[PDB]
Amino acid sequence: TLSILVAHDLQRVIGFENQLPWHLPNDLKHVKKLSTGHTLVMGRKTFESIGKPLPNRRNVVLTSDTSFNVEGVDVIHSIEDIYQLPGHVFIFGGQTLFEEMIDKVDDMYITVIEGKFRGDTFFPPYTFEDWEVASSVEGKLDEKNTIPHTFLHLIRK
């Protein structure tokens, strides 16, 4: 399987100044559970906004930088290399990678953040005419998770 994994708001904002605009522990747990034991593919900027690979899964970074070498990170230099990675692969961000991959993935795991944030990076537009709703699960609000959010699993029709 080739999947997208993304959290976006009502206007498809995914980022602001190389950070996420929201803090939602429930969504981070969601990411952890889906991707532990599998593969994350991300653009260079997304990786550098964290600077350390996520434990207990393969972290793949796409960059043109032939000098890129980070301990615990595998590097690729072409979109075409993504198709050679084994197992379940998750396109993890950012805007550029989403734009390049949205037409290619089998399915999408989307956390819809039910708010409107200031952003400078966006998930590309998509229509539910192209995607079946495999599941739609309301996130639980509480002390530490105070923005309404819905976990969607979308599969290409």
Binding region for ligand NDP (CB under 6 A): 6-7, 14-15, 18-20, 42-46, 49, 62-65, 77-79, 92-97, 100, 121
Counting contacts by CB under 6 A, is residue 50 touching ligand 52V? Answer: yes
Interacting span for ligand 52V (CB under 6 A) from 48-56, 62-70, 98-106, 131-139: 48-56
Per-residue three-class SS string for 73-138: CEEECCHHHHHHCCCCEEEEECHHHHHHHCCCCCEEEEEEECCCCCCCEECCCCCCCCEEEEEEEE
53 binds, among ligand NDP, ligand 52V, none (CB under 5 to 8 A by kind): ligand 52V
- Shortest distance (Å) from residue 64 CB to ligand 52V: 19
- As a whole number of angstroms, the distance between CA 1 and CA 34 comes to 13
Which of residues 16 and 131 has its CB atom nearest to ligand NDP in the complex? 16
Counting contacts by CB under 6 A, is residue 111 touching ligand 52V? Answer: yes
Query: Cis before residue 43, ω within 30 degrees of 0?
Result: no
The residue ranges that bind ligand 52V (CB under 6 A) are 5-7, 20, 27-28, 31, 42, 46-47, 49-50, 53-54, 59, 92-93, 111
